[PDB]
Amino acid sequence: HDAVDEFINAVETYKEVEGISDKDALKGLPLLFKSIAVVWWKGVRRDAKTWSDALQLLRDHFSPT
Amino acid sequence: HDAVDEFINAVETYKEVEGISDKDALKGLPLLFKSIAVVWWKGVRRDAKTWSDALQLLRDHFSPT
C-alpha cells in the first residue's frame, strides 16, 4: 500500500480503461504520468497554498477547453 | 477516469493510509510522486523491454533492502 503500489494501480487502471496495448503503454505511459506529476509539483511550488487547491489545480490544468 | 483522476486517487489513498496531514502532504507528496514517476520513466528508457518488466522494475528500485 505504499506510494509506488498506488502509482502502479493508477497507471494500470488507466491502461485498462483506455484499452491501451502493452507496447503502446510502455512507449507512452511513463512520459504521460511523468508529465502529470511534474505539472502537479510545478503548480504547487508556483501557486497552490492548500491541499484541496493542489488537487483541484491539477485538474484545471488538464482542462477540457 | 482519465490519467489525472487516477493519479489523484493514488496520492489521496497514500495520504489516507499513511495518515499524512494536509500540510505535510502539500509540502511532501508532489516531490515524492514526481520522483516515482521520474524513476519509472528513467528505468524504462534505460533497461525495461516489456510492460510487466516496467512495472516490476519500479518496485525493485524502491526495494526494502
Author numbering:
A (entry chain A), B (entry chain A): 9 to 73
The paper states:
Drosophila has two isoforms of Arc, dArc1 and dArc2, with low sequence similarity to mammalian Arc, but lacking a large N-terminal domain. As opposed to the corresponding mammalian Arc lobe domains, which are monomeric, the dArc lobes were all oligomeric in solution, indicating a strong propensity for homophilic interactions.
In our 1.90-Å crystal structure, dArc2-NL is a domain-swapped dimer, in which the second and third helix of the canonical lobe domain join to form an extended helix. One layer of the dimer is formed by α2 of each subunit, which pack at a cross angle of 140.7°. The other layer is formed by the remaining helices, and α1 lies in a groove formed between α2 and α3. The subunit interface of the dimer spans 3440 Å2 of buried surface area. The solvent-exposed surface of the dimer is charged and polarized; the electrostatic surface potential of the side formed by the two coiled α2 helices is highly positive, while the opposite surface formed by α1 and α3 is mainly negative. In our structure, this fragment could not be resolved, due to flexibility. The binding surface for the N-terminal segment is buried at the interface of the dArc2-NL domain-swapped dimer. Taken together, the structure of dArc2-NL reveals an intrinsic property of the Arc lobe domain to form alternate dimers via domain swapping, possibly regulated through interactions of the folded dArc2-NL core domain with the N-terminal tail.
